[PDB]
Design an enzyme around this catalytic site. Sequence first.
Site, PDB file in Angstrom:
ATOM      1  N   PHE A   1      24.326  52.035  79.170  1.00 54.61           N
ATOM      2  CA  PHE A   1      23.589  51.272  78.109  1.00 54.61           C
ATOM      3  C   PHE A   1      24.116  51.946  76.755  1.00 54.61           C
ATOM      4  O   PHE A   1      24.202  53.054  76.458  1.00 54.61           O
ATOM      5  CB  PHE A   1      21.949  51.641  78.008  1.00 54.61           C
ATOM      6  CG  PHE A   1      21.346  51.146  79.192  1.00 54.61           C
ATOM      7  CD1 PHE A   1      21.088  51.470  80.494  1.00 54.61           C
ATOM      8  CD2 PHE A   1      20.508  49.836  78.752  1.00 54.61           C
ATOM      9  CE1 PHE A   1      20.277  50.925  81.385  1.00 54.61           C
ATOM     10  CE2 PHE A   1      19.843  49.131  79.630  1.00 54.61           C
ATOM     11  CZ  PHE A   1      19.462  49.757  81.011  1.00 54.61           C
TER      12      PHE A   1
ATOM     13  N   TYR B   1      19.679  47.377  72.302  1.00 52.41           N
ATOM     14  CA  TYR B   1      20.432  47.970  73.386  1.00 52.41           C
ATOM     15  C   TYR B   1      21.424  46.948  74.280  1.00 52.41           C
ATOM     16  O   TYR B   1      20.850  45.604  73.929  1.00 52.41           O
ATOM     17  CB  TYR B   1      19.575  48.509  74.514  1.00 52.41           C
ATOM     18  CG  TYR B   1      18.647  47.604  75.075  1.00 52.41           C
ATOM     19  CD1 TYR B   1      19.171  47.024  76.397  1.00 52.41           C
ATOM     20  CD2 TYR B   1      17.493  47.142  74.621  1.00 52.41           C
ATOM     21  CE1 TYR B   1      18.285  46.075  76.935  1.00 52.41           C
ATOM     22  CE2 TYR B   1      16.638  46.055  75.116  1.00 52.41           C
ATOM     23  CZ  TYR B   1      17.121  45.457  76.584  1.00 52.41           C
ATOM     24  OH  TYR B   1      16.331  44.633  77.089  1.00 52.41           O
TER      25      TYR B   1
ATOM     26  N   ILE C   1      12.833  52.667  82.301  1.00 56.70           N
ATOM     27  CA  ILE C   1      13.579  53.688  83.281  1.00 56.70           C
ATOM     28  C   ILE C   1      13.571  54.887  82.713  1.00 56.70           C
ATOM     29  O   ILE C   1      13.528  55.192  81.536  1.00 56.70           O
ATOM     30  CB  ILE C   1      14.941  53.105  83.690  1.00 56.70           C
ATOM     31  CG1 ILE C   1      15.675  52.959  82.635  1.00 56.70           C
ATOM     32  CG2 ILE C   1      14.701  51.765  84.529  1.00 56.70           C
ATOM     33  CD1 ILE C   1      17.192  52.427  82.961  1.00 56.70           C
TER      34      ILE C   1
ATOM     35  N   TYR D   1      17.024  52.047  88.877  1.00 58.27           N
ATOM     36  CA  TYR D   1      16.382  51.350  89.718  1.00 58.27           C
ATOM     37  C   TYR D   1      16.457  51.428  91.242  1.00 58.27           C
ATOM     38  O   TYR D   1      16.145  50.945  92.040  1.00 58.27           O
ATOM     39  CB  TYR D   1      16.690  49.492  89.663  1.00 58.27           C
ATOM     40  CG  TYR D   1      16.222  49.211  88.090  1.00 58.27           C
ATOM     41  CD1 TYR D   1      17.085  49.249  87.250  1.00 58.27           C
ATOM     42  CD2 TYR D   1      14.962  48.517  88.068  1.00 58.27           C
ATOM     43  CE1 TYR D   1      16.711  48.870  85.749  1.00 58.27           C
ATOM     44  CE2 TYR D   1      14.562  48.316  86.656  1.00 58.27           C
ATOM     45  CZ  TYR D   1      15.509  48.111  85.696  1.00 58.27           C
ATOM     46  OH  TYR D   1      15.149  47.846  84.398  1.00 58.27           O
TER      47      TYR D   1
ATOM     48  N   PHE E   1      24.095  42.924  81.825  1.00 60.89           N
ATOM     49  CA  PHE E   1      22.993  42.060  82.389  1.00 60.89           C
ATOM     50  C   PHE E   1      21.757  42.019  81.501  1.00 60.89           C
ATOM     51  O   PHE E   1      20.929  41.067  81.679  1.00 60.89           O
ATOM     52  CB  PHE E   1      22.539  42.875  83.814  1.00 60.89           C
ATOM     53  CG  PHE E   1      21.944  44.175  83.510  1.00 60.89           C
ATOM     54  CD1 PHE E   1      22.488  45.275  83.638  1.00 60.89           C
ATOM     55  CD2 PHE E   1      20.652  44.332  83.053  1.00 60.89           C
ATOM     56  CE1 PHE E   1      22.279  46.714  83.147  1.00 60.89           C
ATOM     57  CE2 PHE E   1      20.119  45.564  82.817  1.00 60.89           C
ATOM     58  CZ  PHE E   1      21.126  46.726  82.948  1.00 60.89           C
ATOM     59  N   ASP E   2      21.636  42.535  80.383  1.00 64.25           N
ATOM     60  CA  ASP E   2      20.737  42.478  79.401  1.00 64.25           C
ATOM     61  C   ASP E   2      20.976  43.037  78.136  1.00 64.25           C
ATOM     62  O   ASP E   2      21.768  43.830  77.916  1.00 64.25           O
ATOM     63  CB  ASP E   2      19.545  43.086  80.036  1.00 64.25           C
ATOM     64  CG  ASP E   2      18.124  42.716  79.189  1.00 64.25           C
ATOM     65  OD1 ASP E   2      17.886  41.687  78.583  1.00 64.25           O
ATOM     66  OD2 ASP E   2      17.312  43.726  79.362  1.00 64.25           O
TER      67      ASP E   2
END
EC number: 5.2.1.8
Length: 107
Positions: free
Chosen positions: A99, A26, A56, A82, A36-37
């Site tokens: 995502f 992902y 999540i 979040y 961010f990731d």
Amino acid sequence: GVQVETISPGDGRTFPKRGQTCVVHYTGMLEDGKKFDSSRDRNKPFKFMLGKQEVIRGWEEGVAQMSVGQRAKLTISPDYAYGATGHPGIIPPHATLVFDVELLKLE
Ligand SMILES: [N+]
């Protein structure tokens, strides 16, 4: 909630069930396209057990609608991500997250 858009089709038959381990690649981005990731940058797939709330809500619900081999874009509202507090330093308050997720296999 979570919106799932197909980028590339899976087998259209094998969907994740509660208790199964999903192996995915992902990339997570903020609404403006800032990454961010990403497991892809670490060259190591991510594993999580569906139903154990290790991820999540948007993942728990979105990945469940994907079949093995499928690559999809998931758009997730803050309440399924979040929330209002976010994750200071990484994820801003009330952030909508996007995502790019590929479901590799189920274990
Ligand atoms: N949070």
